Amino acid sequence: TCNLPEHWTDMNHQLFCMVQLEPGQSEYNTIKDKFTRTCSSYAIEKIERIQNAFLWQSYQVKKRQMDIKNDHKNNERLLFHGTDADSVPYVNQHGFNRSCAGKNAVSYGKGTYFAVDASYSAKDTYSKPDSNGRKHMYVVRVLTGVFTKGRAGLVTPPPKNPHNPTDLFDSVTNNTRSPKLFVVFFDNQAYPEYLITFTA
Amino acid sequence: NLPEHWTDMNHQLFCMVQLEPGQSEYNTIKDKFTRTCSSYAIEKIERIQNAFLWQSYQVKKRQMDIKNDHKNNERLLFHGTDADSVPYVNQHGFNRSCAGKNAVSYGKGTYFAVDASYSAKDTYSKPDSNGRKHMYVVRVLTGVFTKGRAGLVTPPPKNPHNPTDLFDSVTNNTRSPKLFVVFFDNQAYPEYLITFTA
Numbered sequence: 135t136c137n138l139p140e141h142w143t144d145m146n147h148q149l150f151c152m153v154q155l156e157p158g159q160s161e162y163n164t165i166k167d168k169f170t171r172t173c174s175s176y177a178i179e180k181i182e183r184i185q186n187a188f189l190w191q192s193y194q195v196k197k198r199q200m201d202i203k204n205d206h207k208n209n210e211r212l213l214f215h216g217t218d219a220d221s222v223p224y225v226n227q228h229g230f231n232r233s234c235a236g237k238n239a240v241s242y243g244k245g246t247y248f249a250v251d252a253s254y255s256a257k258d259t260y261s262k263p264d265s266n267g268r269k270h271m272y273v274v275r276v277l278t279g280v281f282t283k284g285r286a287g288l289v290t291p292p293p294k295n296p297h298n299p300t301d302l303f304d305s306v307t308n309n310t311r312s313p314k315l316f317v318v319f320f321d322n323q324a325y326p327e328y329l330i331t332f333t334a
Numbered sequence: 335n336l337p338e339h340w341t342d343m344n345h346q347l348f349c350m351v352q353l354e355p356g357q358s359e360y361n362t363i364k365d366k367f368t369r370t371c372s373s374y375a376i377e378k379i380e381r382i383q384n385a386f387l388w389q390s391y392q393v394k395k396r397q398m399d400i401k402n403d404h405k406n407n408e409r410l411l412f413h414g415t416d417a418d419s420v421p422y423v424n425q426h427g428f429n430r431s432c433a434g435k436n437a438v439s440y441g442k443g444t445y446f447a448v449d450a451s452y453s454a455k456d457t458y459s460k461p462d463s464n465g466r467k468h469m470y471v472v473r474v475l476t477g478v479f480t481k482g483r484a485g486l487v488t489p490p491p492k493n494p495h496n497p498t499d500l501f502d503s504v505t506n507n508t509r510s511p512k513l514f515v516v517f518f519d520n521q522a523y524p525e526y527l528i529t530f531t532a
């Protein structure tokens with residue numbers, strides 16, 4: 135699938151690959167710094183770039199649509215998502231699925247949740263340590279677009295005007311002034327870009 | 335890249351286009367509907383021109399055609415809905431998070447019927463206060479399918495030792511499918527809206 139970004143490595147005609155990043159090169163350093171800004175006490179085992187051509191293609195289609203609809207290109211944020219080891223193969227291949235969100239982690243709506251700070255996704259309740267103590271967190275491109283405060287029980291973002299109920303916000307947050315989380319409610323509004331495997 | 339049979343929308347992104355009973359386009363839909371719904375009468379048939387939904391759906395179709403190594407992945411199916419959901423569906427498609435539970439559930443997704451008679455039941459195409467019932471004709475990427483189960487949140491894996499390689503959809507019966515369930519956004523494009531009455 136097309137418009138692959140220039141920093142991906144050649145995939146030998148594969149449509150999906152996980153590429154372990156070389157420590158000390160610019161790309162690895164950039165992601166490490168984002169994580170260590172709030173997670174300096176954790177130890178990074180490796181960082182992998184997710185090269186999922188089909189997921190990227192569908193995400194970029196949604197990004198172009200949101201850029202057109204909102205009349206600007208300020209629609210993407212880089213956020214974090216902690217998950218358990220058993221969900222990692224699914225996310226790598228299929229992205230994030232609101233139908234899989236826990237349960238008790240839905241306080242601002244029934245969508246997929248993304249943290250501004252890696253430290254929040256680093257909680258064991260999200261990046262559940264596996265049998266060997268390894269924890270997993272994604273660095274995610276998220277199409278947050280135009281957002282509003284969320285609330286429990288939402289299944290889609292609220293409309294921007296209750297008298298035009300189909301023109302929706304793009305995401306919801308806990309606090310519009312100083313957001314710490316964003317929730318998106320549609321597939322392919324979030325692209326898992328890097329996987330960080332780390333320990334306490 | 336919008337289809338050439340669509341009306342020129344003057345850079346608008348969404349339009350409903352009323353079809354004329356003369357046309358082959360109208361007649362094929364009427365015939366597909368009447369094959370199992372001879373007791374009902376069509377008020378109108380509208381072509382749904384939704385640029386963004388079409389783009390995302392066509393991307394998914396190309397991906398599924400590549401993955402399955404054939405082009406037998408799409409079926410034209412029916413979906414009855416209440417009038418209050420029509421504005422949302424026209425704009426945003428079918429949302430599994432909004433779907434009612436089916437009387438026989440083969441999974442938690444959006445349901446599409448082979449026969450218009452199924453979608454024509456008042457349980458799905460609920461009559462509005464003016465007696466109007468609403469049924470979509472939908473391009474659905476059914477792909478490779480298996481018999482569903484009520485607990486499904488996505489289609490099951492084809493192979494339990496490769497849990498991420500999924501069937502594309504599920505059905506009530508693989509020998510004689512009458513319903514298909516899909517579990518992802520942009521796997522179904524609402525192409526026509528039939529408004530009909532008893």
Ligand SMILES: NC(=O)c1ccc(I)c([N+](=O)[O-])c1
Pocket residue numbers: 214215216217239247248249250254255260261314315316
């Ligand atoms: N999976 C996560 O990183 C995650 C789950 C729930 C929440 I409420 C948050 N959060 O950043 O607020 C993150």
